[PDB]
């Protein structure tokens, strides 16, 4: 039985839905850990040695631990599952990694993983094909009605404002503008000042924080802007199993529900 190592929880869960136990799916950066300076352990090096295929996000998500994907099993490829996604920068240059926060992109993650699994394990091609379509449809069925509702928001109110720049791909997929306090979790006073200024200028009503960062900056910004704190979104990791976002589909569904419930 082949072993497919995903870099972090979101990719692991996508892969499990496509492979359904035809392969063993493992995860390096488990739910509740963050990729930036994640410390690869000895046990983790075992996962790496066992992998027949390594599935990474790219867009620099793994940059701090790519060096551990070395001395690999012969034949084992590293696949970037965001291939085909036009990157969105962190400036007016380095890429923002959060490409999974998008309905269009979910379909691209699935397709690239389907393709890689099929190349690895061609005897099960018909199964990966069916599974990939089923899962793509399940995501569409859950998430499209939330998009449809979001799209009714009056143009002046088409802003996604968060703490980390975690929704920039969602904004591009749905046709919203994004404002945030820092591009990636690991914090700048000028970026806070800008968001405050932009919220006042555009009468922006809500700002969110996220499940792996502090709510204090968002709350402070809300106070300074006479905006409201929108609460916590799940974006960078799956939740614990009894939390609200234990799968990728549940993560998209929770965060988009919370956004649409806010913005109406
Ligand atoms: Mn992040």
Separation CA 209–CA 221 (nearest Å): 11
Please name every residue paired with 5 in a beta bridge, in sequence order, or none if there are none.
26, 54
Separation CA 18–CA 21 (nearest Å): 9
Q: Phi-psi bin for 154: left (phi > 0), alpha (psi -120 to 50), beta? A: beta
Q: For each of the domains in the chain, give its residue range(s) and CATH number, in order of start.
A: 2-151 (3.40.50.1980), 152-263 (3.40.50.1980)
Separation CA 21–CA 32 (nearest Å): 24
CB atoms within 10 A of CB 133: 13
Residue (of 169, 230, 175, 222) closest to 200 by Cα position: 222
User: Is 36 known as a binding-site position?
Assistant: yes
Distance of CA 203 to the CA centre of its chain: 28
Say if CB 248 and CB 238 are below 8 A apart. Answer: yes
Lookup: tokens for 148: 């449809």
User: Is 60 known as a binding-site position?
Assistant: no
CA angle 26, 30, 34 (to 5 degrees): 135
User: What 3-state class would DSSP assign to 92?
Assistant: coil
Separation CA 1–CA 151 (nearest Å): 45
- Between the CA of 239 and the centroid of ligand 1 the distance, in Å, is 14
Residue (of 61, 66, 44) closest to 101 by Cα position: 61
- Where do runs of H (alpha helix) occur along the chain? 9-19, 42-50, 103-120, 125-150, 168-174, 189-201, 216-225, 248-263
- Between the CA of 212 and the centroid of ligand 1 the distance, in Å, is 8
DSSP β-ladder status, 3-8 and 24-29: parallel
- Between the CA of 164 and the centroid of ligand 1 the distance, in Å, is 7
Say if CB 50 and CB 81 are below 8 A apart. Answer: no
Structure resolution, Å: 1.6
User: Is 164 known as a binding-site position?
Assistant: yes
Residue with tokens 């690991």: 186
- Between the CA of 121 and the centroid of ligand 1 the distance, in Å, is 32
Distances (CA, A) of 210 to 100, 109, 129, 204: 15, 22, 34, 18
């Amino acid at each position: 039985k082949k072993v497919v190592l995903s870099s972090f929880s979101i990719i692991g869960d996508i892969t499990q839905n496509i492979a359904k136990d035809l392969v063993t799916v493992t995860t390096l950066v488990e739910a509740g850990n963050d990729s930036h300076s994640y410390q690869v352990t000895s046990a983790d090096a075992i996962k790496i040695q066992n992998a027949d295929l390594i599935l990474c996000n790219g867009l620099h998500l793994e940059e701090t631990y790519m060096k551990y994907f070395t001395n690999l099993k012969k034949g084992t490829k590293i696949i970037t599952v965001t291939d085909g996604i036009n990157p969105i920068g962190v400036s007016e240059s380095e890429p923002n990694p959060h490409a999974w926060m998008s309905l269009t992109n979910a379909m691209i993650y699935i397709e690239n993983i389907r393709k890689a699994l099929t190349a690895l394990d061609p005897s099960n091609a018909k199964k990966y094909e069916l599974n990939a379509r089923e899962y793509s449809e399940k995501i569409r069925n859950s998430i499209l009605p939330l998009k449809t509702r979001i799209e009714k928001v009056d143009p002046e109110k088409r802003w996604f404002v968060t703490s980390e720049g975690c929704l920039v791909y969602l904004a591009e997929d749905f046709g919203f503008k994004s404002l945030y306090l820092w591009p990636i979790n690991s914090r700048s006073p000028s970026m806070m000042r800008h968001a405050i200024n932009q919220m006042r200028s555009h009468k922006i009503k809500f700002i969110f924080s996220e499940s792996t960062n502090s709510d204090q900056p968002a709350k402070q910004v809300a106070y300074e802007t006479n905006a409201s704190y929108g609460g916590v979104l799940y974006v960078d990791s799956l939740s614990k199993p009894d939390g609200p976002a234990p799968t990728y589909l549940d993560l998209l569904r929770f965060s988009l529900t919370k956004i649409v419930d806010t913005l109406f």
